[PDB]
């Protein structure tokens, strides 16, 4: 589960950068789509962790 | 995109945002309570004969950072504003949640939204009279639905009805 845990950390880093990008910005649908995509990956990784 | 509808679960802690999401997504329900940070899901469904996808963003009952909350709320196309019928304070909290949604989407006129009174299986513990919640939803111009993520009562209905509101808005544009 070390591999999954490290990928969670990597995707969380990317999620934080997308929140930084989006805050106070011009409406950016492409970046919003990537935000939800990264969250979907995080959710899937955590589901795998719990069996 | 008329084939992808973006739904956000909003409401205070413990009301069943994640339970509704996971019942809808996977037909699962567990009694455990693990507070959400943020989670997201995608599902293919048939909505009135057309094959579409629903994206769901499941939020924290209380977000540490205003910017994170605003980023999530601004990205949604429609909202399920959830409270628990067993916790009156969660019902009163919906008013401020709605204001936050309206502020962050200020260029949009009528935001697709439904008020969801969850935990309808716990009728004997009700603290929110049906009439109080119905009246508030009428004042906001939205549907009120009572749900149970545990028994599946009206769970599909709230997600499909919100998708229909989003589809209506998208066609009007
Ligand atoms: N009986 C019953 N219990 C429910 C129902 N929905 C949720 N619960 C229970 O209520 C608790 C909180 O549910 P949960 O979905 O985590 O709520 P949440 O709004 O996602 N919480 P948070 O904001 O912290 O992420 C859990 O113990 C869950 O089993 C319901 O319809 N009926
Ligand atoms: Mg949750």
Residue numbers in the entry:
A (entry chain C): 395 to 445
B (entry chain A): 11 to 183
Text of the article:
Ral GTPases have been implicated as critical drivers of cell growth and metastasis in numerous Ras-driven cancers. Upon association with and activation by Ras·GTP, RalGDS activates the Ral (Ras-like) small GTPases, RalA, and RalB. The Ral GTPases share a panel of effectors including RLIP76 (also called RalBP1), members of the exocyst complex (Sec5 and Exo84), and the transcription factor ZONAB. Our solution structure of the RBD of RLIP76 in complex with RalB revealed that the interaction is mediated by a well-structured coiled-coil domain in which more than 80% of the interactions with Ral are mediated by the C-terminal α2 helix.
The tightest binding sequences, termed HLR (E427H/Q433L/K440R) and SMLR (E427S/L429M/Q433L/K440R), displayed affinities of 5 and 3 nM for RalA, respectively, a vast improvement on the wild-type RBD affinity of around 100 nM. We obtained high-quality crystals for both the RalB/RLIP76 RBD HLR and SMLR mutant complexes, which diffracted to 1.5 Å resolution. The HLR mutant increased the binding to RalB 28-fold, which is broadly similar to the improvements seen by SPA. A variant harboring the single Q433L mutation was produced and bound with a similar affinity to the HLR triple mutant, indicating that the Q433L mutation alone was sufficient to increase the affinity for RalB by 25-fold. The mutant RBD structures show that the side chain of Leu433 contributes to a hydrophobic network of interactions involving several Ral residues (Ala48, Leu67, Tyr82) and Trp430 of RLIP76. In the wild-type RBD complex, Gln433 points out to the solvent, leaving a space at the edge of the hydrophobic pocket where Trp430 is buried in an interaction known to be essential for the binding affinity. When the Gln is replaced by Leu, the side chain shifts toward the pocket and fills this space. Replacement with arginine in the HLR and SMLR mutants allows this hydrogen bond to be maintained while an additional hydrogen bond with the backbone carbonyl of RalB Ala48 is gained. However, the K440R mutation only exerts a minimal improvement in binding of the RBD to Ral proteins, as evidenced by comparison of the E427H/Q433L (HL) double mutant with the E427H/Q433L/K440R (HLR) triple mutant, which bind with similar affinities. The replacement of Glu427 with histidine or serine breaks a salt bridge formed with RalB without forming any new interactions and ITC data demonstrated that this substitution did not improve binding to Ral proteins.
